[PDB]
Design a protein around this ligand. Structure first.
Ligand SMILES: Cc1cc(CN)c(C)o1
Ligand SMILES: [Ca+2]
Length: 223
């Protein structure tokens, strides 16, 4: 997250870190045994880390649970990043509490102008490289489909939306991949892609979660 703020320990209780020897992606806990992330975060050997603030220090509220299975969306295209969504099942159910909690799926799509919270352990620099240890947060509005398409000619599908600031300065970045965009207590987006970070007229692009609720529910119900 570039141009954000330090969230505060366990203030974003649905935020997970995906770890394969190191943090490589964010995710969102949607029930006691399932995480939603980006399909571009797919790899084998995933451990889900919940209750994290400082990802380099065991602070006492963590639960570390290995993934038993991952399900990449059947229509995910890695070139275009269309349908950039994946489900991860935990080998055992997380113990839910005030610091480890699920986030509700949307019942309807959020509109341009809706204020959301984006979070992650990604790069905090727009030019250089600096990775924070503690979770960073950014309040950002959803941008109109028209401005999103104008920002990225030929690249925005019906499964994507832009959020952030056309002036730049405040954005998601590398390492935030797969993490949450939460608006009014609903998971509306997944950190997906962009062009650099916090650059003028290049806002973050997010997977449009409301399009996938039926798939998520049916997949969970049979797996
Ligand atoms: C994970 C990620 C988010 C964004 C949006 N600035 C980029 C380039 O990479
Ligand atoms: Ca920790």
């Amino acid at each position: 997250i570039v141009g954000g703020y330090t969230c505060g320990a366990n203030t974003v209780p649905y935020q997970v870190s995906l770890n394969s020897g190191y943090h490589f992606c964010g995710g969102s806990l949607i029930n006691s045994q399932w995480v939603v992330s980006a399909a571009h975060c797919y790899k084998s050997g995933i451990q889900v880390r919940l209750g994290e603030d400082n990802i380099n220090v065991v602070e006492g509220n963590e639960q570390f649970i290995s993934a038993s299975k991952s399900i990449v969306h059947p229509s995910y295209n890695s070139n275009t990043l269309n349908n950039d969504i994946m489900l991860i099942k935990l080998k055992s159910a997380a113990s839910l509490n005030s610091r480890v909690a699920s986030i509700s799926l949307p019942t309807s799509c959020a509109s341009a102008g809706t204020q959301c919270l984006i979070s992650g352990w990604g790069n905090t620099k727009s030019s250089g490289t600096s990775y924070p240890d503690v979770l960073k947060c950014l309040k950002a509005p959803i941008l109109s489909d028209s401005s999103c398409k104008s920002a990225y000619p030929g690249q925005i599908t019906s499964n994507m939306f832009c959020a952030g600031y056309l002036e730049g300065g405040k954005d998601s970045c590398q390492g935030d991949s797969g993490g949450p965009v939460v608006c009014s207590g609903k998971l509306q987006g997944i950190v997906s892609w962009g062009s650099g970070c916090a650059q003028k007229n290049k806002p973050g692009v997010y997977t449009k979660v409301c399009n996938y609720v039926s798939w998520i529910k049916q997949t969970i119900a049979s797996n």
